[PDB]
């Protein structure tokens, strides 16, 4: 047991109403919108295949020249009400918004820098408009914040001198000022999701990460804070040097979700996966033919997978410079919304069921102990294997959409064959189980 001043604060999962709401939401959208949407992955005639929001880095553009894109920031088609309607129709219960990305351009009129929406042709407080519009649709708003900031020369990647330590301290004050500004301007914020926190400078200032968490929690009652923010006394990130999760939930799994057999440890804490539609484009990229683009069923699979293991899932959008969404993203949102409207009782406010994974798909557990089978891979056997934990029996199976009764056959102790429906549903579908636990 290593003594730590700046390690974990929560003992197990938070169970206050704000955390329960964060968890029960389950399905979110991400918005990555900033100056990078203007070039859209192209600089000086070269299209770069790397993530579009990192174009400043790929094309080696100096800060002064990158930030002159503010002169072209004029999203004529932007309408916060339309963005919120799109999220509602998709079935998303919360939206995470890039307040400021690594480029340092702020989507709110910060009083602490000139690189903000106020100093563009458009002028308006985009962040504020979105907060209002989403909240008006009953959608929670979370703030993405990049600590790393390419626009501020006080940022340091590492601390190799007293001068660096002084400059970086000033940088951390500036960061605190922006954070407090966001928390006091937009008090309905429910979460702060940090990125750009991997550098040695931040790792050497674990105290600051703990302070930022505490500062925001005093300003915004019940706010959630992601693990990615946090480094302990030894520089260890996400989980402290004693293996304990820092912040309120684990933020990770952008590349690959937790394995449903080998990574059951994640059911012990709150967690959230965030996902791109292409392989690795968060901001707007003009050419989606450069990498694999996920289909709606592939995204739906990921969403259910997350919930089945006790986690949230957030689907990313990278709006066009004009303030509208590309057609592929409108199609995705509509497709997800259709399926969610039919089958969402197996997603919203659901959790890990504690059953052994089977090949046909995933289990999820509802708040009244409903066990939902979400079937993605239809067996030629016409039988869905259900192995129950000790003391649990399956009493009935019902097709969620129609209420039709589904045959259940016991094959051996604690194992059943659940029949597939009489008519193939032709899409991923749900069977709801009634289970009983012995005394
Ligand atoms: C951080 C940023 O570097 C990326 O551009 C993007 O904002 C994603 C969401 C985030 N990625 C990770 C691994 O933290």
Provide the number of structural domains: 2
Structural class: alpha/beta
Order of helices and strands: HEEEHHHEHEHEHHEEEHEHEEEEEEE
CATH topology of the largest domain: TIM Barrel
For the largest beta sheet, what order do the strands appear in spatially? Answer: 7-6-5-4-1-10-9-8
Tell me the overall shape: globular
Bound molecules: the ligand *[C@@H]1[C@@H](O)[C@H](O)[C@H](O)[C@H](C)[C@H]1NC(C)=O
Helix content: 25-40%
What is the gyration radius calculated from CA atoms? 23 Å
CATH class of the largest domain: Alpha Beta
Give the total of beta strands. 17
PDB class: hydrolase
Keywords: Fucosidase Complex Covalent Inhibitor, hydrolase
Assembly: monomeric
Entry title: Crystal structure of a bacterial fucodiase in complex with 1-((1R,2R,3R,4R,5R,6R)-2,3,4-trihydroxy-5-methyl-7-azabicyclo[4.1.0]heptan-7-yl)ethan-1-one
